[PDB]
Amino acid sequence: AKKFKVVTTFTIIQDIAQNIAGDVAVVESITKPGAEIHDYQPTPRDIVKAQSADLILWNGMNLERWFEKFFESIKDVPSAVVTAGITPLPIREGPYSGIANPHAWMSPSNALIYIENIRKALVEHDPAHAETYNRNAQAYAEKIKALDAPLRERLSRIPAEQRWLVTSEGAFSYLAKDYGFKEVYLWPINAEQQGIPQQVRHVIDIIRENKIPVVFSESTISDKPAKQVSKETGAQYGGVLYVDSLSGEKGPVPTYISLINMTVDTIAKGF
C-alpha cells in the first residue's frame, strides 16, 4: 500500500530515520547529497514534497535557516525537532557567537538521542507500525553504540597535545569534544560572512605554534581556503571530511555510520 511518508530537511536525518522506519515507511530528504544545508534555498517542488508527507523531521538548533519560513507554506503536516533534549555547544566566535552549534549528530552518543526522538515521532504519528519502529530503533542504537570502541582505537595513535582538528567550517565541535580534540576552523558556521580572509591568517599562526600536521575541508563547501592554509604552512591538506551531507548511494559515504567512520578514518590518516 501507500506507505507512511517522512520528509526530512537533509540527508543525515533521512538515513537515521530510514533505519528506524525499515520497510514500513518511506523517508526522503529535501536537500540532495552534496548540497549546502544551512542556507539552502527551497523551491516550489520542495513545498509539494513536504506537503505530501505524513511527518516532517528537522534538526532545529537553527541548522536550517530556511526551514521555519518554508514550513509556513505546509498545512496539516506534523513536524518534530530531532535534537530535542540535546545540550548544545555554543558557537564560540563570529557573527553567530553564542548561538547553538547545530552539528550535534557528529557525536554518536548524541545520535542515540536523535534516534529516540525519531522513534517517538514515528510511533506517535504511525501507531500501526509502532512495534517495528521500536524494534528497528533499538537495533540501530546498538549499531551506533558499537562504533565507540573502533573509533577511539582508530584515533589512539595521536597523542593528546597533538590532537588538533583543523577544518574549514567549525562543524566538528561535538565530535572533537567526544574524542578529546582541540578545534580550529576557518569559519565558525556556514553563512555569507566576513572575517574568513583574516581568520585564515590566525589559523596559520596556530598551526605554526603547535606544529599541526594536517588541515581539512568538508564535502558541501569549497576546499580552496584549507588548501591555501596548507600551502602557507608546514601542514598537509588531509582531504574532505563529511558532516553536513551524505554522498550519493554509490558514493563513499552513503549512510550516517559511514559518515562518522570515514570522517574519523580521514582524520586519523592525516596524522
- Distance (Å, whole) CA 94 – CA 109: 27
Residue whose grid cell is 582505537: 153
Report, in Å, the least distance between residue 170 CB and Fe ion.
9
> Which residues define the annotated binding site?
38, 103, 169, 244
Distance (Å) of CA 106 to CA 84, 100, 161, 239, 244: 15, 14, 22, 18, 9
82: its cell numbers: 530531532
Nearest residue (CB) to Fe ion, 169 versus 183? 169
Of 132 and 199, which has the nearer Cβ to Fe ion? 199
CB of 111 to Fe ion, least distance (A): 16
- Grid look-up 582538528 returns 165
Report long-range pairs for 197-206 (Cβ below 8 Å, ≥24 apart): 200/225, 200/228, 200/229, 203/166, 203/229, 204/229, 204/232, 204/233, 206/164, 206/166
C-beta of 132 vs 219, nearer to Fe ion: 219
C-alpha–C-alpha distance, residues 224 and 68, integer Å:
32
Q: Which is nearer to Fe ion, 7 or 12 (CB)?
A: 12
Closer by beta carbon to Fe ion, 4 or else 242? 242
Q: Footprint of Fe ion on this chain (CB under 5 A)?
A: 169, 171, 190, 244
Least CB distance to Fe ion at residue 241 (A): 11
Binding site per annotation, positions for Fe(2+): 38, 103, 169, 244
DSSP assigned state of 118: H
Smallest distance, Fe ion to C-beta of residue 68, A: 18
User: What is 88-100 written as a DSSP string?
Assistant: PPBP-SSTTTTSB
Task: Match 566538528 to its residue by C-alpha cell.
Answer: 172
Q: 88: closest CA among 56, 113, 65, 66?
A: 113
Cβ pair 243, 103 in contact under 8 A: yes
CB of 22 or CB of 195, closer to Fe ion: 195
